[PDB]
Amino acid sequence: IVGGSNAKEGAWPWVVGLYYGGRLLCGASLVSSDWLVSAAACVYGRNLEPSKWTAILGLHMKSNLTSPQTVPRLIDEIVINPHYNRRRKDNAIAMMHLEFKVNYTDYIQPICLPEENQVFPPGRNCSIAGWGTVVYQGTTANILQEADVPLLSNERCQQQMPEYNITENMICAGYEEGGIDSCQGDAGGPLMCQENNRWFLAGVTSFGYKCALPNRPGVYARVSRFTEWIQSFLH
Amino acid sequence: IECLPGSSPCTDALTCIKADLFCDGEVNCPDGSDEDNKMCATVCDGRFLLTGSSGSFQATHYPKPSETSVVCQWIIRVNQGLSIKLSFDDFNTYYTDILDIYEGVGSSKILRASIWETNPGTIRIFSNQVTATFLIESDESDYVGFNATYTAFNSSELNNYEKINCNFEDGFCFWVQDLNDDNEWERIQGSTFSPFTGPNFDHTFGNASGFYISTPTGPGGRQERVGLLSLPLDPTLEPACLSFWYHMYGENVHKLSINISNDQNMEKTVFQKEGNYGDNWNYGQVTLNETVKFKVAFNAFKNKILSDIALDDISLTYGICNGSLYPEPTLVPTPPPELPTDCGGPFELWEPNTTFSSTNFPNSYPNLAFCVWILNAQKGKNIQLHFQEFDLENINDVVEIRDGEEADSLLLAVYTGPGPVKDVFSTTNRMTVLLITADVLARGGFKANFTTGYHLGIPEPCKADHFQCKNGECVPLVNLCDGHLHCEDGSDEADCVRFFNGTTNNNGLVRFRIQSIWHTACAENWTTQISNDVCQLLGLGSGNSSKPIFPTDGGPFVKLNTAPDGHLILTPSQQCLQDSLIRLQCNHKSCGKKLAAQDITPK
Amino acid sequence: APFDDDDKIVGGYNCEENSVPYQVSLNSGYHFCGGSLINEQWVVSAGHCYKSRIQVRLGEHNIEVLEGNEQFINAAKIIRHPQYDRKTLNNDIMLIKLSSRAVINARVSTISLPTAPPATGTKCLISGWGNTASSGADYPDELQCLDAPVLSQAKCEASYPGKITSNMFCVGFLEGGKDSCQGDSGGPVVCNGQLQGVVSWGDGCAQKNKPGVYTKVYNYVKWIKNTIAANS
Ligand SMILES: *[C@@H]1O[C@H](CO)[C@@H](O[C@@H]2O[C@H](CO)[C@@H](O[C@@H]3O[C@H](CO)[C@@H](O)[C@H](O[C@H]4O[C@H](CO)[C@@H](O)[C@H](O)[C@@H]4O)[C@@H]3O)[C@H](O)[C@H]2NC(C)=O)[C@H](O)[C@H]1NC(C)=O
Ligand SMILES: *[C@@H]1O[C@H](CO)[C@@H](O[C@@H]2O[C@H](CO)[C@@H](O[C@@H]3O[C@H](CO[C@H]4O[C@H](CO)[C@@H](O)[C@H](O)[C@@H]4O)[C@@H](O)[C@H](O)[C@@H]3O)[C@H](O)[C@H]2NC(C)=O)[C@H](O)[C@H]1NC(C)=O
Ligand SMILES: *[C@@H]1O[C@H](CO)[C@@H](O[C@@H]2O[C@H](CO[C@@H]3O[C@H](CO)[C@@H](O)[C@H](O[C@H]4O[C@H](CO)[C@@H](O)[C@H](O)[C@@H]4O)[C@@H]3O)[C@@H](O)[C@H](O)[C@H]2NC(C)=O)[C@H](O)[C@H]1NC(C)=O
Ligand SMILES: *[C@@H]1O[C@H](CO)[C@@H](O[C@@H]2O[C@H](CO)[C@@H](O[C@@H]3O[C@H](CO)[C@@H](O)[C@H](O)[C@@H]3O)[C@H](O)[C@H]2NC(C)=O)[C@H](O)[C@H]1NC(C)=O
Ligand SMILES: *[C@@H]1O[C@H](CO)[C@@H](O[C@@H]2O[C@H](CO)[C@@H](O[C@@H]3O[C@H](CO)[C@@H](O)[C@H](O)[C@@H]3O)[C@H](O)[C@H]2NC(C)=O)[C@H](O)[C@H]1NC(C)=O
Ligand SMILES: *[C@@H]1O[C@H](CO[C@@H]2O[C@H](CO)[C@@H](O[C@@H]3O[C@H](CO)[C@@H](O)[C@H](O)[C@@H]3O)[C@H](O)[C@H]2NC(C)=O)[C@@H](O)[C@H](O)[C@H]1NC(C)=O
Ligand SMILES: *[C@@H]1O[C@H](CO[C@@H]2O[C@H](CO)[C@@H](O[C@@H]3O[C@H](CO)[C@@H](O)[C@H](O)[C@@H]3O)[C@H](O)[C@H]2NC(C)=O)[C@@H](O)[C@H](O)[C@H]1NC(C)=O
Ligand SMILES: *[C@@H]1O[C@H](CO[C@@H]2O[C@H](CO)[C@@H](O[C@@H]3O[C@H](CO)[C@@H](O)[C@H](O)[C@@H]3O)[C@H](O)[C@H]2NC(C)=O)[C@@H](O)[C@H](O)[C@H]1NC(C)=O
Ligand SMILES: *[C@@H]1O[C@H](CO[C@@H]2O[C@H](CO[C@@H]3O[C@H](CO)[C@@H](O)[C@H](O)[C@@H]3O)[C@@H](O)[C@H](O)[C@H]2NC(C)=O)[C@@H](O)[C@H](O)[C@H]1NC(C)=O
Ligand SMILES: *[C@@H]1O[C@H](CO)[C@@H](O[C@@H]2O[C@H](CO)[C@@H](O)[C@H](O)[C@H]2NC(C)=O)[C@H](O)[C@H]1NC(C)=O
Ligand SMILES: *[C@@H]1O[C@H](CO)[C@@H](O)[C@H](O)[C@H]1NC(C)=O
Ligand SMILES: *[C@@H]1O[C@H](CO)[C@@H](O)[C@H](O)[C@H]1NC(C)=O
Ligand SMILES: *[C@@H]1O[C@H](CO)[C@@H](O)[C@H](O)[C@H]1NC(C)=O
Known part of the structure; x- marks a missing residue:
């Protein structure tokens, strides 16, 4: 990926x-x-x-x-x-x-579910996991893959990614310059943030436009409302 | 004098040459020992250098089964500028043998000819040196392999008519395969492999007994280049007419072009075809006009499978072209790409219309189907959709049921795969049925009666009290929050203990529901174990310190007691007056605390 | 240009044939045919794949990427059915003998000889480099394992009027040029965990109407045993 x-x-x-x-x-x-x-x-x-x-x-x-x-x-x-x-x-x-x-x-x-009235600030660099691949056209890696990406607000994600509705039901996480991505492949890992040694479930990863593509962060499913x-x- | 391993000396033992270079065709030893007949033990007939203009040669063990795998090689040498004609009468062998005929020696032995399992007939080589190799790769004694005769003839006395006219019934005639090609035009007798592409019969004979040439029949997965180069043609005072038959039947037929190469390096290609034209030989006639010597090149860029191209009955006639007796070829029709989109789907369904199929159940449903059914009924009713037959596909298409009454439809059930499926009920009078199928694997479909009712999916309740669980089982007092499971859904253990007057999940006063009335818990017998039990029953964490603040219930408050079975004993007795009530103070649940090796980046 | 696999989707097929030892490929500079390893030195493949020299790749995880778990064996002898017909591709089955015994590992092993004929509706798997792409027909770098039931003999005969015999059975159904069994010219067809046939031919790359043709191996069990005994 x-x-x-x-x-x-x-x-x-x-x-x-x-x-x-x-x-x-x-x-x-x-x-x-x-x-x-x-x-x-x-x-x-x-x-x-x-x-x-x-x-x-x-x-x-x-x-x-x-x-x-x-x-x-x-x-x-x-x-x-x-x-x-x-x-x-x-x-x-x-x-x-x-x-x-x-x-x-x-x-x-x-795992820890988000608490009531908990809002993740934009730009927050949170961890993602999943058994991704070395490249999109390659073989799935045998070792669990982890990465750290910053969160993006929905308002900014709409401007940066005018391809999907996204809205507030899901949150975009990734780098505006690309490089690091794990949404694609057979990862299926969750997006996890840090809450002072308490691993809160930030969200569940979902479809991605393109791996490591600049200004195309992984649009993971927000679970705070769920x-x-x-x-x-x-x- | 000794030689290194992998190489052998000559007869004079003065020069060491590679073993693969022995009898290859090019003289390597100073005395020519590497091409000597005695040194190159052919075994087949004892002769290696065929300096004569004509003769005969047979394979290993002409009167005996070939129990031993013996490789034979012959070099036929004639005067410079003369061609050599090889005549083959019988080559019906059960494979396992390779017959290679190469024009010249050395680097020219790459892809000149390769014939197996079929009699090649007559093969003409336009060189003073011809290499004939019979290779046996296994100890197979099925057949001798061949027995052929050869002669010689002049290569330039032939006129333009003879050099081009060829029915391909007796080999390639005078055509020479281009050495720059990635492959060669294979000679096939009858229908080829991989049907539904290429010719199934020979044009010259009209049946399978004839011989023609075409692209290789192997399932090649890479694009290659093939080409036939004609002999130079002397200039004539009158333009000639070139007639040929071409068979282009295949989905991946890329190109087929005819070019003219002359001393001026000017090409004015007059024939070019592409695509599929059908399983029939098409007649191509063109007029050739030139003032100098020129060569006609038939070039074809062979694509992947289903791209077979064949040529047969090529000839050149002196004189201007006459009226063509055959029309121009027509392209094979293809499915129309004019906005296939979807099938649109049927109209809205109401109460009178009950029975429906996808598009047409008995035969099939059109591809890329997006059928939408808007099931509506009277207000206050619910929809039951039981399927008589459900024989969809696997993970290609799926029937989705969405709850209505609002734009934000709620998913109810997704059905796919063969076999009957369970009934689906809706919470309102509006239901959406979506048939999401791809463009492939369109089965018969489904069929449902689409019945309506009132609370069809709701389990039947019981009158006259008789407290019911989620499944509807009557549990008035037998399973009323006492640790006993009788209900199928397991709802007999519902939360009969909660918190009230609290600003969060861990604040307020704890209330217990004995049978139907909620009563507060006093501080008469509050202990750490009871606090932990309350935390567990309320789905909370560690039982941190908690103290009473103020009472609210002055009546029969619930006294808490410890029991060996792990269930708190609740006593609905008012044993104290104005006793302070315990305020709930419990910690968060022991969630996934970071006890692993995961690191935190301090940036 | 967004990628086809935007989400955690493998296309609905077992990519690269993970934990599939019975699938082997035939290479002579390029991938042209597949086959099933039945014994330590016996491979069943399509009978029209014969050529001068054949190499056998066992446990090839990816055709274009060498994962190091594949084994290369130089084929010794290829035997076609004595009643094989070139025109109609009848009895399109051949046996390849390996010059060296196969090494049993996680992704290389031998599949037991079938003992029962295929039946209609049997859960069967077709293994091979099928055309898995958004559009067009092309061989990808991955591998496809299609779960398709075996069609009836009458339906198989009706699909190819005059081109189906007692040794031909149909697994492909309906029509469509997208991801399916397609060709691969000898893709293993294993039903109920036992090898049942190979992919022989069809109406192109499943362009329309009939998807393809599969040649049985149960009818050739005696022939396979005789060939093994004669070429042990
Ligand atoms: C396929 O189509 C071809 C196209 O015509 C069709 O014709 C057959 O052609 C072959 C050779 O091309 C014929 O076989 C020989 O042809 C020579 C030609 O001169 C004859 O002289 C041969 O006969 C000699 O031997 C006979 C033996 O008794 C003698 O009695 C006779 O006097 C000759 O000395 C020999 O026939 C073949 O005969 C023709 N066939 C016909 C019906 O003309 C071929 O038949 C087609 N094949 C099919 C439909 O299976
Ligand atoms: C239930 O399924 C039916 C199957 O298609 C739906 O179609 C209805 O079928 C009936 C029976 O033929 C049609 O009744 C006909 O009505 C015409 C006159 O109506 C036409 O003209 C008016 C304008 O005056 C126009 O508004 C209509 O749309 C029609 O074009 C008569 O001449 C006929 O003899 C016959 O009685 C219905 O018209 C037809 N409805 C359609 C096509 O929408 C039916 O609608 C379904 N029921 C529902 C959805 O409630
Ligand atoms: C039979 O004869 C025909 C002649 O009609 C042969 O056609 C060949 O046609 C090409 C035309 O394609 C383009 O022509 C450009 C010149 O006009 C040429 O420059 C192109 O090459 C490159 O050009 C640019 C700059 O380098 C580059 O960016 C492109 O990507 C391209 O690669 C291109 O070729 C003509 O050039 C050929 O000369 C001509 N071939 C001839 C005359 O022999 C046809 O190939 C012939 N068929 C055969 C020989 O089998
Ligand atoms: C084998 O055939 C070739 C045919 O090319 C014979 O060579 C001679 O080739 C020329 C063409 O280059 C033929 O035409 C002659 O050309 C000369 C000019 O060089 C011209 O002055 C003559 O009037 C004539 O047009 C020539 O006829 C041909 N010679 C022949 C046929 O004897 C070659 O000789 C042939 N080999 C043998 C052993 O005869
Ligand atoms: C999961 O954890 C439990 C302990 O936390 C492991 O032990 C199991 O503990 C339960 C609770 O006490 C035992 O149930 C008891 O069994 C005795 C009879 O041995 C019975 O008299 C008691 O009334 C009570 O029912 C259980 O037996 C015990 N062992 C098990 C379940 O095998 C448990 O082993 C852990 N499981 C795994 C898979 O690690
Ligand atoms: C293959 O065809 C060649 C065609 O070229 C044509 O040749 C004729 C004469 O042979 C040219 O006619 C001339 O036209 C001049 C004006 O441009 C007149 O002044 C002159 O008197 C004569 O009429 C004609 O223009 C020319 N075509 C073009 C497009 O220029 C022919 O020349 C070759 O001989 C022929 N090769 C053969 C028959 O082997
Ligand atoms: C009831 O809960 C008590 C928990 O009180 C707080 O617990 C947190 C731990 O999550 C303490 O945070 C720590 O504070 C340290 C400095 O005191 C830091 O060095 C450390 O990194 C961490 O942040 C917090 O201090 C603590 N509060 C107080 C006021 O101490 C727990 O301590 C009790 O044992 C528990 N049970 C009872 C009966 O009280
Ligand atoms: C969000 O993901 C982060 C990716 O890491 C950033 O990569 C850049 C590459 O330049 C590092 O830049 C260096 O930063 C130094 C200061 O840290 C500069 O002195 C140096 O010249 C160069 O600019 C950058 O440090 C590195 N991280 C950051 C943000 O510093 C990751 O590291 C981030 O921590 C993660 N985002 C957050 C919120 O921190
Ligand atoms: C349309 O819906 C039918 C539903 O099946 C219907 O079942 C009825 C039940 O029969 C009664 O059973 C009682 C208890 O066994 C018995 O006492 C009584 O005497 C009756 O036998 C039956 O009466 C209806 O005829 C039957 N409906 C039909 C159409 O046969 C469903 O089977 C059908 O698939 C649905 N249609 C579609 C297209 O899905
Ligand atoms: C998907 O995004 C579009 C805009 O890209 C949304 O369209 C806007 O919707 C709001 C309220 O729904 C309107 O006030 C705006 O006028 C619309 N157009 C804009 C903002 O250009 C659309 O609503 C989104 N989809 C969903 C389901 O919310
Ligand atoms: C299983 O695989 C892991 C992967 O590193 C390895 O550490 C371990 O030793 C293996 N065996 C067992 C019994 O876990
Ligand atoms: C073509 O026309 C010429 C002139 O009319 C005639 O002599 C010839 O017989 C016709 N047919 C062929 C095949 O040349
Ligand atoms: C708790 O809330 C209830 C509302 O149902 C109220 O009647 C009661 O007085 C409250 N108790 C307090 C505030 O102590």
Whole structure:
């Protein structure tokens, strides 16, 4: 995807890979002991047969999976956010059920949803993850890819990217000069910010116009307004 | 004198030359030992240098099966300026053998000729030296391989008529493959591989028994260049007429051009075709006029598969061209690209119209379909859409159901793939049905009755109290927030404990619902374990310090007690007067604290 | 010029055929045909791919990018079916013998010989470098694994009137020139985890109407065993 960096061993315990038919396709965040939050676009149309979705929690590399640090689970129920339209690729948020219960350990850690009346300032440089590729026309990297990108306000993103509606339902994060990007490829990782050693879920990554293209930041799905919807299923 | 490994000495043992250079065709040893007949043990017939103008040669073991893989090579040498004609009578072999005929020796042995599994007939080489190699790559004793005869003839006594006229039934006649091409025009008897492109029969004979030339039949994945160069033609006082038959049937047919190369380096190409013209031989007739010697070049840029081009029945006749008896070729029709867009979709559906299909269920639905159904009914009703048959595709198209009553439609269900699908209910009287399909794999479609009702998807309630859960199971007091699960949805454990008069999720007064009435919790028996239990029941974090502030409920407040089963004992007894009520003070949940190796950039 | 894969979309197909050991390619300077490795030194491929020299690439993750997990083997002998017809491409199946035994690894292995004929509606996978692009027909650097059910024998015969025999079965359905099974001239066709056929020919690169033709291998099980015994 050009610009990404390999994540450290166990540096992202809140990222769980998803396999459909034996191939990694998307990622998700561990919100509770029985729920995962992933992009709705990468799982749209495949929710009719949850048995074909296998969730590997604590996934670091695709070389091996039968390790104590990795928790395999079978998805039973998939819920798609009603506001998703697939026309403007907005509100691409979906939830998956992890059987009955999931424990927690060093390599399996939960995630933090945004609090009430929490606003991310523009220009805030937050981290993104996902198993991206070295280049768009290349092979998917075997090591988890991480990057740091600054946030962009919706008003400025409309002027910089007059291609999608975007609006306030999703937030643009990236570099106006390009160079570093991880939205493309089979990453499926979430955009995460820093809140004084508290890993708040800033958002879920989504479609990108072009990797490392200047003035084309990754338009990731904002989850601040969808915190109540997630907590409704969680609680 | 000794030679390094990989090289061998000559007969005189004075010069060391590479093993691959032995018997190649060019003299390397000072005495010519590398081309000597005795040194080059042909085994086939014992002769290596065919200095004679005519003769015969046979493959390995003419009367015996070829149990041993023996490679044979012959060099035919004649006077300078004379051509050599090779006649082949039988080449019906079960492959595993390679017959290579090369014009000249040395760097000219690249792509002159390569014939296998088919009798080449007559092959003419316009050089004083001809190399014939029979290579056996395995110990296969199916056939001897060939038995041919050769002669010689002058290369320039031929007039313009003979040098061009060729039915290709007995080889390439006098045409010479261009050495600058990336490949060569393969000779095929009958239909070629990869059908639906290229000719299926020979033009000269009219059936598959004939022989013609065309592009290579292999599934080449790269663009190459091929070309046929004609012999020089002496100038004539009258312009001539060139007639030919060309077969251009294929989706990726790039180009096919005819050029004239002369001493003036001036090209005035008069014939050029491109695209698909159909599975039929088209007649091309042109008039040639020139004052000096010139060569006619048939050039073709071969594209990927489905780009086969064939040529047959090429001739040149002295005199001005007569009236052509065949029309100009016509391009193969293609699907119209004039704004295909979509199918538009049907109109709005109402109560009287119930049964509907995508476009036409029995046959198929048009590609790039975006059918929109606006299901509406009477106010206060809901829509049930049960599908009698659902035989869509995989991850190509998907039927989407959107809740109406507003512009911001709410997704209800996405259906795809073969097999029956469950019924879908709407929360209002307006529903949107979208058929999102690509331009490929358009199956029969779906079909639904589109029924209407009142609370069709709502589970049936029970009258006369009988408290119901989300699924509708009657749980008045059996499963009323007591840790017992009976409801299918698991809603029997709903939040019967909450916080009131609070500015946030961790502020206010804790209230418990015993059966149907909320009562506050007193501070008579408040402990750290009870605080942690309250935090857990309210979905909170660590049970930090909390103290009572002021009471609000002076009636039968709920007293909290500890129990071994992990459930707080609630006593609805007023054991104290004006007792201060505990104010909820709990920490945030133990979320994903950064205990990993993730770094923070201080910029 | 935005990229086609704007989101986390692989096009709906298993790109590069991850964990697919039964898919091998035939190279002689370029990619022309595919095949299925059935034994340590036996590859089933389309019978029209024969040429002077053939190289076999096993476990090739990418055709244009060498990941280092592929193996190159010089082919020894190629045998075509004795009843192979060039005009109609009937019995378009051939067997290639490897000069060296295949090395079993994660992406290189042997698939068991089939024991049952294909059935209608069977969940089957077609592996090969299919034409996966937004527009046009071209071989990409990735690999396609299409999940397509096997069509009925009567439907297969109706698709090609007079061009389908008892050794031909159809997996492609409907029509369309976009991402599909396409050609590749010998793409493995494996149903229920067992090899069932190869891609022989079709109406071009699925331009319209009939997608393509697949030649069975169950009818040639005795022939395959005889060839293995004679060319062990
Ligand atoms: C395919 O189309 C061709 C186009 O005409 C069609 O004709 C066949 O051509 C071949 C050779 O081109 C013929 O085979 C030989 O042709 C020579 C030509 O002079 C004849 O002299 C041969 O006959 C000799 O041998 C006979 C043996 O008894 C003697 O009795 C006779 O007197 C001759 O000495 C020999 O026929 C072939 O005969 C023709 N066929 C016809 C029907 O004319 C060819 O038939 C087509 N193939 C198909 C439709 O399968
Ligand atoms: C339910 O599905 C139907 C199937 O297409 C929809 O089409 C309706 O079909 C009926 C039956 O033929 C048509 O009734 C006809 O009406 C004409 C007269 O109307 C025409 O002229 C007026 C102007 O005077 C114009 O406004 C109309 O649009 C018509 O062009 C009679 O002459 C016929 O004999 C026959 O009775 C309906 O007109 C037709 N509606 C259409 C095409 O919109 C039907 O609409 C569906 N019901 C809904 C959507 O509620
Ligand atoms: C048969 O004869 C025809 C003659 O009609 C041959 O056509 C060839 O046509 C080209 C014309 O294309 C362009 O011509 C320019 C001159 O007018 C030439 O400069 C172009 O080359 C480059 O030009 C610029 C500057 O370098 C560069 O930016 C371009 O990208 C381009 O690459 C271009 O060729 C003519 O030039 C050829 O000379 C001519 N060939 C001839 C006369 O032999 C046709 O190829 C012939 N077919 C054969 C030989 O098989
Ligand atoms: C996940 O964590 C738990 C502890 O946090 C691991 O141990 C499990 O703990 C529960 C809770 O006490 C045990 O349930 C108990 O079982 C005993 C019988 O052994 C029963 O008498 C009690 O009434 C209570 O039901 C459970 O047995 C115990 N072991 C399990 C679940 O295997 C648990 O092992 C952790 N799981 C994983 C996958 O790491
Ligand atoms: C093999 O054929 C060639 C044909 O080119 C014979 O060479 C001689 O070639 C010339 C053409 O260059 C023929 O035409 C003659 O040209 C001269 C001018 O050089 C002209 O003065 C004559 O009036 C005549 O037009 C010439 O006829 C031809 N010689 C022949 C046919 O004897 C070559 O001789 C032939 N080989 C043999 C062994 O005969
Ligand atoms: C291949 O064709 C050649 C065609 O060139 C034409 O040649 C004629 C004469 O042969 C020219 O006519 C001349 O025109 C002059 C005015 O420009 C007159 O002054 C003169 O008397 C004569 O009529 C004609 O112009 C010319 N065409 C052009 C476009 O210039 C021909 O010359 C070659 O002989 C012929 N080659 C053969 C037949 O082998
Ligand atoms: C109830 O919660 C108590 C938590 O009080 C606060 O906890 C935060 C930790 O998130 C403290 O922040 C730290 O402050 C240090 C300096 O005192 C810094 O060096 C450090 O980096 C971090 O910022 C905060 O100080 C603390 N507040 C006070 C007033 O101490 C906790 O301490 C209690 O144990 C817990 N339980 C009970 C029964 O009180
Ligand atoms: C948002 O992503 C950041 C990308 O890093 C920036 O890269 C530039 C390259 O020039 C660094 O520039 C150097 O900056 C020095 C001061 O830091 C200058 O003295 C030096 O000449 C050159 O300009 C730049 O430092 C580097 N980071 C920054 C912003 O300094 C990343 O590093 C950012 O931290 C991340 N954004 C935020 C909010 O910090
Ligand atoms: C249109 O909707 C039909 C719905 O099926 C309908 O089912 C009716 C039920 O039969 C009754 O069953 C009772 C309990 O078993 C029994 O006591 C009573 O005697 C009846 O047998 C049946 O009566 C209707 O005829 C039947 N509808 C039709 C059209 O046959 C659905 O099956 C159909 O697919 C829908 N159409 C489309 C295009 O989807
Ligand atoms: C997508 O963006 C366009 C502008 O690029 C929005 O159009 C504006 O909509 C607002 C209110 O909806 C109007 O007041 C403006 O006049 C519109 N035109 C402009 C700003 O040029 C459009 O609304 C956006 N889509 C959605 C769903 O909000
Ligand atoms: C699995 O792969 C990881 C990747 O680095 C490696 O560290 C580990 O040793 C492997 N084995 C186990 C049992 O985790
Ligand atoms: C063409 O016309 C000329 C002159 O009328 C005539 O002699 C000849 O027979 C015709 N046919 C051919 C093939 O040349
Ligand atoms: C808490 O709020 C309720 C509103 O329902 C009010 O009746 C009650 O007096 C409040 N208690 C306070 C402010 O102590």
